[PDB]
Amino acid sequence: ESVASHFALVTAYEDIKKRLKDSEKENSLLKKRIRFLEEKLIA
Amino acid sequence: ESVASHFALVTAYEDIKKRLKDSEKENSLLKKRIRFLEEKLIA
Amino acid sequence: SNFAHVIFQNVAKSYLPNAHLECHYTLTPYIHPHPKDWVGIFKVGWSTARDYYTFLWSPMPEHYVEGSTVNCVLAFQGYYLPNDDGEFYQFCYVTHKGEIRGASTPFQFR
Amino acid sequence: NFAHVIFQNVAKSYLPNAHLECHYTLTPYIHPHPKDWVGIFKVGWSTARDYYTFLWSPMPEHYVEGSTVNCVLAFQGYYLPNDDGEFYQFCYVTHKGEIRGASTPFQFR
């Protein structure tokens, strides 16, 4: 059971690691879209 | 040291958990800004 | 190995806090279910089968044939589910002998 | 039992195959040794043999029992992981094998 607990935690960690990478990539895109939209308003 | 390994993994998971929660939080706010900016610009 | 004889299907990344939740899962040919098997909703990082947030007994499949693949569904009620508490949870299938035989990807209630 | 060395200013990301400086602090709760080592470990490691690389944690000069001394180690990019998507952490492992420090995770990217 101690082994199952460690396995289940690695499995959860691996999924949250992937989701962090997806989140950070979206973060970069949304920030570029904002810079583009703010830049449109200054002209 | 199976419990040290579990401990180290728990704390590593908790850090990545917090990073994911913050990144998704910011992402939702970034989307609110994009709508707010676009409302000034297109339709 | 033994930890993946039950497969949780189409688990989402998050569920609405305190909303009714259907939990779908599959018994592979490697497990013979038992009426005292159960599915728990566990905070990620749990140490024992005792650390569950809520649970439901797993209904013994009717007309069960050994070595078959069987689909199962459990309706967790919102009033026994986490609120938006900042935590991540997962489903775990626990046999009547105490073994964890499947554990899902994690989800948050928000 | 596991927080007796603290890694300071440990970041989220270090450049791959690049010169890295590793800052950590010896707290008066455990005692340094010349053959104590700082290992870099993939998150999820099971035993101390799962290290990626390490370096000997040098002994500070005129070491006074029960002090607080900060240390710096310079791993070089030849020994460090690539941009592999994995999370690693710092682990202080002593000469008799116990780990008394596990940093927050970082990537190499």
Inter-chain CB proximity B7 and D48 less than 8 Å? no
Mutate to test the interface with A, among C100, C101, C107 (most CBs of A within 10 A): C100
Burial class (CB in 10 A: 0-12, 13-18, 19+), D68: exposed
Query: Distance from CA of residue A42 to its chain's centroid?
Result: 30
* D73: β partners: D22
Query: Is-contact C77 C54, C-beta < 8 A?
Result: no
> Considering only CA atoms, which of D57, D51, D99 is closest in space to residue D74?
D57
What token pair was written down for A28? 């970069």
* C-chain residues near B10 (CB < 8 A): 45
Residue with tokens 């101690």: A2
Fold classification of C1-110 is Immunoglobulin-like (2.60.40)
The identity of residue D104, as a single letter, is T
Helix (H) / strand (E) element for A34: namely: helix A2-42
User: For residues C30 and C7, what is the distance between their CA atoms, to the nearest angstrom?
Assistant: 11
CB atoms C88 and B17 under 8 Å: yes
Q: Could you tell me the resolution of this structure in angstroms?
A: 2.3
From A9, A23, A37, residue closest to B20, measured CB to CB: A23
The first and second tokens of residue A6, run together, are 């460690």
Elucidation technique: X-ray
Domain layout of chain C by residue ranges: 1-110
DSSP H or E segment with residue D6:
strand D5-7
CA gap B20, A32 in Å, rounded: 20
From chain A, the residues in CB contact with B16 under 8 A are 13, 16-17, 20
No. of helices (H) and no. of strands (E), chain C: 0, 9
User: Does C45 contact B13 at a Cβ distance shorter than 8 Å?
Assistant: yes
Instruction: Compute the nearest-CA separation of B15 from chain A (Å).
Output: 10
CATH 2.60.40.2840 fits D1-109, yes or no: yes
Give dist(CA D106, CA D85) in Å, integer. 10
